[PDB]
Amino acid sequence: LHIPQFFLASEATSPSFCGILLRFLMERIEDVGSADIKKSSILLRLFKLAFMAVTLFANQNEQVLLPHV
């Protein structure tokens, strides 16, 4: 999980990786309430990482999140 975190905390790569990750997670959103702790913990952590990336660079990542909220 350190690799997505590293890519999302860098000004150069954060927007594109955030877009790719959100596009991927929107297809899995139905697995959040799966009752299998292993399955849901990772998805929740990935969503939180994307949201923190949005918070870090507001002037660039807001438009990435806008079409998904």
């Binding site: 927007p15 594109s16 877009g19 790719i20 596009r23 990435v64 079409p67």
Partner: protein, 471 residues
């Protein structure tokens, strides 16, 4: 008896866990004790009333476990009490065991809650099956109890949920048999009101303040009106003696609903139009021209091209197959040429352009080529070259937004695609592209054709090799 009363009263409390406890207690009394048959026969009405109340009173934004428990218990009870049922037991005397239960279940077919209506119709069907009978036979005596109240008031003044329930009840009733609901003046007035409601605008319907739930209500009402009008269109007595433009008006409303922004409305209108086209087998020229005019109006300028209009064109192509003409694909290709600017494309690179609007419009344009008539086999070279050039400008290999529609179009003419590729076996680009296409999980038709014609593939390759060139 006291224990049963406690369980039944638990179902009426306002806490959901008490309701669940009541339903579970009734289930335990039914399927784990065996107090006898007369006991259940004497408790059945109270049990049914309590379970139906649990279904009615649960808030719809909480978890659905309690309602499911109530429905399962009701299923078990109905299975138990109809063990040796007979048609004489279900119908009123010319006392019957199940006539009162049948009447009570019939009385809930127009409820404002959709789960209640679903449960009631499921239970009525389950009872009818066990007695080797038809639903209309059981429901004929009690038809007035539903029909009379609905015809009394004007449908326009009622709240949304009541209207939806009433229309759904009438729609279900008019499917049991061909003469269940006569085409009298009340039904005609109701159908005209439904047509007016379906043709109306959101602002006129109490206004659309952009609120989520008002929009949901309006969409549901439109779907119900479309369904009832579609069912009425199947009767030859509807709109015939009038000789007025009633059926044309219904078709126009269907077409107008096909071009909406709501997916459920699109699906309902699609089903209705499919049924109409299948039944009619012919179409007056003026009506189809009126239906087609808005679609062709929006495909004349590249500056105002939108994804929505191309989606409308795709739906229309799917509906009317042998009605369109070639030379629209050429116009679409010209529009694509106009939109794709070298400076715009140069700027678009360096960014994750999957979210750009112009790229989405171009992808929507490419998405239409697998819906065009059979004669569209002559555009293969044009589209392949266009996509390759676009990808070259954007510096993309193996991936782009335009690959999926292109694959969908290519998987329809495997013979032509394979012949075209084998005609260009001395170029790396085309072989690489075909190999990339073959590796997508959805290219089974092309894989089958290639597995069949491996012999021809090897023959052409061997001819090239024996020719003795540098390539």
């Amino acid at each position: 008896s006291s224990l049963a009363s406690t369980f039944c009263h638990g179902c009426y409390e306002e806490e959901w866990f008490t309701k669940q406890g009541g339903a579970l207690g009734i289930q335990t009394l039914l399927t784990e004790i065996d107090l006898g048959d007369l006991w259940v026969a004497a408790k059945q009405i109270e049990f049914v009333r309590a379970l139906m109340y649990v279904v009615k009173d649960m808030p719809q934004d909480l978890p659905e476990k309690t309602r499911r428990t109530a429905q399962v218990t009701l299923e078990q009870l109905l299975a138990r009490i109809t063990r040796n049922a007979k048609k004489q037991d279900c119908l009123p005397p010319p006392p019957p065991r199940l006539a009162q239960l049948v009447m009570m279940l019939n009385s809930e077919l127009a409820h404002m809650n959709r789960h209640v209506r679903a449960t009631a119709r499921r239970s009525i069907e389950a009872i009818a099956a066990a007695a080797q009978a038809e639903v209309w036979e059981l429901l004929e005596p009690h038809k007035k109890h539903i029909l009379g109240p609905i015809y009394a008031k004007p449908l326009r003044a009622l709240p949304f949920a009541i209207q939806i329930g009433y229309i759904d009840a009438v729609t279900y009733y008019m499917s049991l048999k061909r003469d269940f609901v006569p085409f009298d003046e009340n039904l005609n007035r109701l159908l005209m009101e439904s047509l007016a409601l379906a043709d109306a605008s959101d602002e006129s319907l109490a206004g659309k303040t952009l609120e989520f739930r008002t929009h949901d209500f309006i969409v549901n009402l439109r779907v119900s009106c479309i369904k009832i009008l579609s069912r009425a269109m199947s009767f030859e007595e509807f709109g015939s003696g009038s000789n007025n433009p009633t059926r044309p008006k219904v078709v126009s409303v269907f077409f107008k609903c096909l071009y909406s922004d709501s997916q459920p409305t699109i699906d309902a209108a699609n089903d209705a139009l499919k049924a109409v086209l299948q039944h009619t087998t012919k179409l007056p020229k003026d009506l189809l021209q009126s239906g087609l005019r808005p679609v062709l109006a929006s495909l004349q300028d590249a500056k105002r091209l939108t994804v929505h209009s191309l989606d409308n064109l795709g739906r229309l192509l799917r509906l009317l197959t042998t009605y369109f003409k070639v030379e629209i694909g050429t116009r679409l290709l010209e529009h694509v040429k106009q939109i794709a600017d070298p400076n715009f494309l140069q700027q678009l690179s360096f960014t994750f352009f999957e979210q750009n609007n112009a790229m989405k419009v171009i992808a929507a344009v490419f998405n239409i080529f697998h819906l065009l008539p059979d004669a569209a086999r002559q555009f293969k070279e044009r589209v392949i070259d266009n996509v390759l050039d676009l990808e070259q400008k954007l510096r993309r290999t193996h991936h782009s937004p335009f690959r999926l529609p292109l694959y969908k179009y290519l998987n329809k003419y495997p013979s032509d695609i394979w012949a075209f590729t084998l005609q260009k076996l001395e170029d790396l680009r085309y072989g690489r592209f075909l190999a990339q296409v073959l590796r997508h999980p959805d290219s089974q038709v092309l894989r089958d054709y290639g597995a069949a014609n491996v012999e021809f593939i090897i023959k052409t390759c061997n001819t090239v090799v024996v020719s003795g060139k540098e390539t």
